[PDB]
From a paper:
As a core component of the hnRNP complex in mammalian cells, hnRNP A2/B1 is an abundant protein and has been implicated in numerous biological processes. The B1 isoform contains an insertion of 12 amino acids (aa) at its N terminus. Both isoforms have an RNA-binding domain (RBD) composed of tandem RRMs separated by a 15-aa linker, and a C-terminal Gly-rich low complexity (LC) region that includes a prion-like domain (PrLD), an RGG box, and a PY-motif containing a M9 nuclear localization signal (PY-NLS). Here, we determined the crystal structures of the tandem RRMs of hnRNP A2/B1 in complex with various RNA substrates, revealing the molecular details of specific target RNA recognition and shedding light on the mechanism for hnRNP A2/B1 in various RNA-mediated biological functions. The two RRM domains in hnRNP A2/B1 interact with each other extensively in a fixed antiparallel orientation, and the binding surfaces of RRM1 and RRM2 align in the same plane, which forces hnRNP A2/B1 to bind two antiparallel RNA strands or a single-stranded RNA with a long connecting loop.
In order to understand the molecular basis for hnRNP A2/B1 recognizing different RNA sequences, we grew the crystals of hnRNP A2/B1 (aa 12–195) in complex with different 10mer RNA mutants. Three complex structures containing RNA mutants A1G, U6G, and A7U were determined at high resolution. In contrast, hnRNP A2/B1 adopts distinct strategies for binding another two RNAs that contained mutations in the UAG motif recognized by RRM2. When U6 is substituted with G in the U6G complex (5′-A0A1G2G3A4C5G6A7G8C9-3′), G6 lost two hydrogen bonds from Arg99 and Arg185, only keeping hydrogen bonds with Glu182. However, the recognition of the AG core motif by RRM2 is still well maintained. Interestingly, the recognition of AAGG by RRM1 is exactly same as AGGG in the A1G RNA mutant, though their binding modes of AG motif are different, suggesting that RRM1 can accommodate various purine-rich sequences. Moreover, two hnRNP A2/B1 proteins bound to same RNA strands can adopt various orientations, as seen in the structures of the 10mer RNA and the two 10mer RNA mutants A1G and U6G. These diverse orientations are mainly due to the absence of direct interactions between the RRM domains bound to the same RNA strands.
Residue numbers in the entry: 16 to 193
The structure:
Amino acid sequence: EKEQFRKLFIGGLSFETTEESLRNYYEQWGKLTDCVVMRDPASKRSRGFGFVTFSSMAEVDAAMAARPHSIDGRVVEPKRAVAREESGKPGAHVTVKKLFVGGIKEDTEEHHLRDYFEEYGKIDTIEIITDRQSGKKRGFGFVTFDDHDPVDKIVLQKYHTINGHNAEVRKALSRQEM
RNA sequence: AAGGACGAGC
């Protein structure tokens, strides 16, 4: 478990929040190997966000299942840290409840996706996409969860073995565009 | 949406 699999961005922090209270707070779900509140170099004031890193991906998952999170009188806004290498890429920092899944071919059905994806989180809807004219399966689908974190969690692995296929998953982007 | 670490002349 490389650090980017165990690291959370924390947004919406009180400007009073320090590394200490961030650490105290998040250590109820485990050991932290790193913790920072980001500060303005000139004024030394909190920029309103920080990062925490747990020792195991188990602990991140327990923290994020354990939401919402309040610290210093504010509900904060945690999200899995997108790899630095990915900054500047299209949709890198997008936050969405909907997953694109491609490479599922013409034999994959709602239940195949429901079976595979349900232990990541609560699924609201599964859409297996068909041609409007033929009704043939187009080889891709979308899964919509009740929260963004299953999506964020799922896409840290690019390929998923679903119904005998090595499917690629991505954050669902708007049509719209795209 | 990045300070550190990974990797500062160790």
